[PDB]
RNA sequence: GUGGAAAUGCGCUUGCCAGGUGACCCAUCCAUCCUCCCACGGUGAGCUUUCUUUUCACCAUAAUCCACCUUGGGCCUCUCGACGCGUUACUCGGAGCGGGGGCUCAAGAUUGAAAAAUGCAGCACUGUCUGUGAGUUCGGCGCAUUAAAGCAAAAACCUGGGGUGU
RNA sequence: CAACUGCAGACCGUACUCAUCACCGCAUCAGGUCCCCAAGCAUCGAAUGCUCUGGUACAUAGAGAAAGGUACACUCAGGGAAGUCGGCAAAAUAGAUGCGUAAGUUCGCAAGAAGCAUUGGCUCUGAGGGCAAUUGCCAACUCAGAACUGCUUACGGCGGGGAAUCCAACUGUAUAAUU
RNA sequence: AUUUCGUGCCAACGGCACUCGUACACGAGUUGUUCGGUCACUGAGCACAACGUUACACCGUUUUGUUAGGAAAGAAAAGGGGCAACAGAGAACCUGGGAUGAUAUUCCAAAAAGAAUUGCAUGUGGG
RNA sequence: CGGGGAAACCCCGGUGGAGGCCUGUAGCGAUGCUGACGUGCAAAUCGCUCGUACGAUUUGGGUAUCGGAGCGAAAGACUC
């Protein structure tokens, strides 16, 4: 029987513009807007793009207001990277630079070598 | 070509109100309009005899 | 059904395994042709394991 | 809307010097108690129907308080 | 409408503090995380830049 | 639903039963008995007519003593451990202000639970 | 060849563009929606992702290769002599 | 600043650099809100030559906030697998399946404040409900399929690397 | 720096319409004009027919079997294309289910090829599930079968088929107003 | 672009009729911190400045990171100033009303019928 | 998932839902009656019938190319 009509003043169905039909104490049925969503925090896209955990999808004005440790963890690259990234780098910086130093002694040990 | 923070300041300076609000509109002939509503502690029928009406 | 039984330990993992792929396979008509088959299964498995 | 859990929080906030007016709601096995601040309606529920008059008779004269009735069109 | 596909490379920039993105034609058999060597001094492998 | 239904057994319907029991159904009519509009016979056959229209289980007629009619002081009252709605004696009720030819000088309304009344109108 | 004798994947064509035509681009097509094998991980995971881009699902690499297949038969001749010409000093 | 072995939880400021949201609209399947039927009940009208525990109408809860069981996904830990888990469906696993215990994201559910003081129908007062089935693109499978067809951009905002301060 | 509190929150639009009468067609013209919401029954159904809510009885009317007309109206004995440049127009087939289906072929099709049978009403039977402790309670209409009984073949909606020759491979475009 | 509303009116007009009217006359009506737009984004694109050409600017270039032989910044930073979307991006408010003749997520007054959210400055308490 | 086979490999039944695929609404068109009208409802319309209807598809707003010129799946088509 009922049949709802616009009520803000766009009369087109895009994706930002979508309604969900109320019923209100008056026994009446009215549209009302329902915003549009976030799709949160994610890590790097040459990197996988994957959603990051412990962080909440969180539009323009709410993220704004929202506590700061809605939005990140407490290690380091908190909010930017995952635990398998942050892993890999910390691996990567540490035998990297073992292999120059090693690389340094053996070099100059043998010139010292070959010149006695 | 008045502002509503113009329209309160010149109410007040020629009748000696206060007020809580003011609303207004454009007529289709050109003319603006405006709503004044004055604070609870004065009477607006008390300032309309004063003025005449 | 195949879920309960298993859950239930009237069936184990290798048989559970078997009959699923056969469900998919289009071999069972109904829930009453399921069960019978399951029957005859785990008494030939009765005979084995008595013969063991 | 926030609620209120005891008492002392009551108190408190009935002395906040801000409070306009206290509402009170006389509803079948409960009390509620409506204090009208800046912002925000702080209610207050008793489920016990004495001390409930004790904390109507001893609030505090200064605030004005009303009590909740069924008002009609022409009331 | 190119039929080619191409590649995103990440430098350092010489003089300053930031990266540098570039774009070019990819060879066959590039793929990501390869590291590309452009320079006189740089080796002969797939996907390096070299003088003629 | 679970079980399909035969024709043969449309005739006869479960009336189904409460479990504490004891509820009871009143009919007042205090205000016609006020005035001359009612009459004693009048109430008499309106306890005969309840008695012999009301149905049980699908059948009319024939009560198992466990639907009483008896009135007193005015008011007819339906003692009864079966279930039933309340609406149906007033539905009844109309029918026989029908057959009198009253239905444009009496009106039956609600008070509470468990209770109807017969009012005039203006 | 339960459902089709010969046509395979091109039965989505019905009876149009000639047999010849369809035969030629029935090879080609096959290759392209196929799973080759990747050298990184040594799985059969690499599918095309428009016409010369190759992703694996398992290592979630992409690759430069050749149009309808991972890799050309140039491509093989091309990575020895470079390697040859590398190992000459 | 600080808690936990871990997933990760709880309570000063940014010359420069780096990421993210914005941001990319799906057949099929499942699905909220919503409306459409049934079963039970309350209220008011309708038909009654004869039948009809019967026909019709109504039975409502806005935003905002507090506290904290279902479904789907990501991950940690213990026990470390060749056969095993799983979808209607074209999958997956020593590059770590499955089972026990946990951390987290999204959509819902539940208790309460708002809020009966409102709304509806009958005549000052009365009544003021829940459970099933079908349909329906919010959301989910970061989804199948053609592709020599394969991510519009930017403001604004968010977090971190360094540095400063205590 | 997080709470609370006090004060102040500028400008323009806002009536009505959106069409068998409010716009464009000289007009209150059977033409044209983008978007959102969309009930019940029959039924595969946004087909088609009828209906609750909402909306309308506004489009010059009255009397009234001349001929000849137009029609989103029909029927005709016997024959059945003899009519005509030409089966033009009309008639005709028709849903669903079971069985059955040729030449030719690029092996995908041709194909609903062609063709045969069944179908109403009423009273029953069987199969296809869920949850709690073998029992109890509960939900959805689909399919198959039987006895009895009847026909005046009885809304709407819904392919006529076959054998060949010429041309163009195919879907598509294209002389708004004679191709 | 006043056709909306109330009261009156029947000369002409609504191809018949009118006591009716979107006709005629006289008076009324459109209320926003949150709704749409500007403030305040880029797109297909446009073309002021600068330069060049033309007897003559009323011509050409002006987004492939981007003007101009080019000294266009008022503590380091290369690349002038703008416009173009009322269906893209962006966007802090919801119900009830006995509140109209005509407006309402725009009106309601101290029990605001009320319940909220957000932008500026202030003041107190923690400091 | 079942069969057959020494191998190479070959068969049945399900599932799945492809296609400038088919019947058919809305939409977009315009074959026949050489129907109606032909001082018309209309300076091209009306009625039945008919083509297509997931694609080289239909459509709103914005933007870009014009008279010795523009644009054209090409008809000397169209440019109020
Ligand atoms: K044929
Ligand atoms: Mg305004
Ligand atoms: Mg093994
Ligand atoms: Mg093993
Ligand atoms: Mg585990
Ligand atoms: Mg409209
Ligand atoms: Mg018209
Ligand atoms: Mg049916
Ligand atoms: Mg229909
Ligand atoms: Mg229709
Ligand atoms: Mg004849
Ligand atoms: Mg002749
Ligand atoms: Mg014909
Ligand atoms: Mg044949
Ligand atoms: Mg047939
Ligand atoms: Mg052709
Ligand atoms: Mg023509
Ligand atoms: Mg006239
Ligand atoms: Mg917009
Ligand atoms: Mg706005
Ligand atoms: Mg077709
Ligand atoms: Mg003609
Ligand atoms: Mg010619
Ligand atoms: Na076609
Ligand atoms: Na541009």
């Not at chain 3, 109904?30 to 030939?44: C, G, W, Y």
């Not at chain 4, 906030?13 to 206290?22: E, L, T």
């Not at chain 4, 709601?25 to 207050?44: A, D, G």
């Not at chain 6, 049980?56 to 039933?84: D, F, H, P, Q, W």
Request: proline residues 3%; aromatic residues 8%; charged residues 30%.
């Amino acid at each position: 029987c009922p049949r709802v009509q616009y009520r803000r003043r766009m009369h087109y169905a895009t994706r930002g513009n979508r309604m969900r039909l109320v019923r209100t104490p008056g026994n009446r049925l009215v549209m009302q807007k329902r915003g549009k969503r976030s799709q949160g925090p994610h890590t790097p896209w040459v990197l996988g793009h994957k959603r990051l955990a412990g962080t909440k999808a969180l539009r323009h004005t709410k993220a704004r207001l929202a506590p700061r440790h809605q939005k990140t963890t407490s290690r380091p690259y908190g909010g930017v990277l995952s635990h398998e990234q942050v892993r890999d780098r910390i691996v990567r910086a540490f035998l990297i630079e073992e292999q120059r130093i090693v690389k340094r002694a053996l070099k100059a040990h043998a010139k010292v070598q070959k010149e006695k | 070509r008045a502002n509503k923070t113009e329209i309160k300041k010149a109410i007040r300076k020629l009748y000696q109100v206060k007020t809580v609000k003011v609303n207004t509109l454009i007529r289709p002939d050109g003319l603006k309009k405006a709503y004044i509503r004055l604070s609870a502690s004065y009477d607006a029928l008390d300032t309309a005899n004063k003025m005449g009406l | 059904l195949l879920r309960k039984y298993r859950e239930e330990k009237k069936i184990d993992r290798h048989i559970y395994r078997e009959l699923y792929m056969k469900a998919k396979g289009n071999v069972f008509r109904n829930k009453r042709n399921l069960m019978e088959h399951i029957h005859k299964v785990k008494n030939e498995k009765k005979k084995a394991r008595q013969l063991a | 809307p926030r609620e209120i859990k005891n008492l002392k929080e009551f108190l408190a906030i009935c002395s906040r010097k801000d409070a306009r007016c206290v509402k009170v709601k006389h509803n079948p096995k409960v009390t509620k108690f409506k204090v009208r601040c800046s912002r925000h309606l702080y209610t207050l529920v008793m489920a016990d129907k004495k001390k409930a008059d004790k904390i109507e008779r001893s609030i505090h004269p200064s605030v004005k308080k009303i009590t909740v009735t069924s008002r009609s069109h022409a009331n | 409408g190119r039929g080619a596909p191409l590649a995103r490379v990440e430098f350092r920039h010489p003089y300053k503090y930031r990266r540098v993105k570039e774009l070019m034609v990819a060879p066959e058999g590039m793929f990501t995380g390869q590291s590309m060597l452009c320079g006189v001094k740089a080796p002969l492998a797939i996907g390096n830049v070299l003088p003629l | 639903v679970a079980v399909r239904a035969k024709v043969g057994s449309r005739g006869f319907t479960r009336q189904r039963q409460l479990a504490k029991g004891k509820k009871v159904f009143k009919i007042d009519c205090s205000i016609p008995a006020s005035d001359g509009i009612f009459s004693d016979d009048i109430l008499s056959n309106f306890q005969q007519y309840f008695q012999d229209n009301v149905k049980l289980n699908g059948r009319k007629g024939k009560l198992t003593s466990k639907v009483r009619v008896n009135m007193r002081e005015n008011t007819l009252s339906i003692t009864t451990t079966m279930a039933y709605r309340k609406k149906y004696f007033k539905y009844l009720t109309k029918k026989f202000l029908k057959k009198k030819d009253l239905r444009d000088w009496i009106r039956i309304l609600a008070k509470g639970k468990d209770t109807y009344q017969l009012k005039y109108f203006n | 060849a339960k459902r089709t004798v010969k046509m395979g994947v091109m039965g989505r064509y019905g009876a149009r563009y000639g047999s010849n035509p369809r035969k030629r681009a029935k090879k080609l097509e096959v290759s392209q929606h196929a799973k080759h094998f990747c050298s990184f991980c040594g799985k059969f995971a690499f599918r095309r992702k428009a016409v010369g881009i190759w992703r694996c699902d398992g290592c979630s690499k992409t690759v430069a290769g050749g149009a309808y297949t991972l890799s050309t038969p140039n491509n093989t001749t091309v990575r020895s002599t470079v390697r040859r010409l590398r190992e000459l000093k």
